[PDB]
């Protein structure tokens, strides 16, 4: 198959409200495992997944190493806000955000499929490492400054060396340590609920609960014809226990049930599911 290690950084300024804040989290596929918050008194890198809280002794220096790396990132982006601000000539009275996402995609053989590093400013693309992991694309003229600084510092090569190196290997170590959580496919618990509106109309809601990974397909049909336009489909939401939820409802006439099949597909299901009231 394919698995991914992904890191997310958010740094934002808050003028007249203290000094800038920097938060960062790490994910193996769709399951967080680490976090860092610069607002904490003595900010440490903290585990956020069960396999990180008990089998993280293999390396007695993991938490110190990651603590210092995260603190350095915190200072880098804290000053970077001042940089991006100067480039655009923006007033310090305003709040602004730098976001970063980087990581690696590994294939079924355990070798790297693709590495990536992307940065946004105020929620819009700012600068990205190209596919060759050797050059940068800056979205506008202000980001050209960052591109020039990073090229003259030879940053892209150290980026590539992390993405093809420590990233892949730590993805493999995490997949091994947390295979009970990460290498699972929990199928959804599915059912249909029935909510009258009038003597003339009823809502039918198709529920998929407690599934992992996040990807799932939920559709209604009437006698065999899709009803994506008529139905209401909420965005997949987490249940707080490390799994996900989704439902899809449709308004149908009273007595006109027993048509309108619900259809669920998920990689944890042996076969796709068909439910009917």
């Amino acid at each position: 198959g394919f698995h991914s290690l992904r890191y997310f950084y958010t740094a934002w300024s808050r003028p007249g409200s203290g000094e800038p804040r920097f938060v960062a989290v790490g994910y193996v596929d769709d399951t967080q495992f680490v976090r860092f918050d610069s607002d904490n008194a003595s900010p440490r890198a903290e585990p956020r997944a069960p396999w990180m809280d008990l089998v993280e002794q293999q390396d007695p220096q993991y938490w110190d190493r990651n603590t210092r790396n995260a603190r350095d990132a915190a200072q880098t982006y804290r000053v970077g806000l001042d940089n991006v601000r100067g480039y655009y000539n923006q007033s310090e009275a305003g709040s602004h955000t730098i976001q970063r996402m980087y990581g690696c995609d590994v294939g079924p053989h355990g070798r790297l499929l693709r590495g990536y590093d992307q940065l946004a400013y105020d929620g819009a693309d700012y600068i990205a490492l190209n596919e060759d992991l050797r050059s940068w694309t800056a979205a506008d003229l202000a980001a050209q400054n960052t591109r020039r600084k990073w090229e003259e510092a030879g940053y892209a090569e150290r980026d590539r060396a992390y993405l093809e190196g420590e990233c892949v290997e730590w993805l493999l170590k995490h997949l091994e340590n947390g295979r009970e959580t990460l290498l699972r496919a929990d199928p959804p618990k599915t059912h249909i609920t029935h909510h009258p509106i009038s003597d003339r109309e009823v809502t039918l809601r198709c529920w998929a609960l407690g599934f992992y990974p996040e990807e799932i397909t939920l559709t209604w049909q009437h006698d065999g014809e899709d009803q994506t336009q008529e139905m209401e489909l909420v965005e997949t939401r987490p249940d707080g226990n490390g799994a996900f939820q989704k439902w899809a409802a449709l308004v149908v006439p009273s007595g006109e049930e027993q048509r309108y099949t619900c259809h669920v597909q998920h990689e944890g299901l042996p076969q796709p599911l068909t439910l009917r009231w």
Binding site: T76, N83, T146, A153
Partner: peptide, 11 residues
């Protein structure tokens, strides 16, 4: 591992 230092860089 978080990617290391950034050698005190500056966007």
């Amino acid at each position: 591992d978080f990617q290391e230092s950034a050698d005190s860089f500056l966007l």
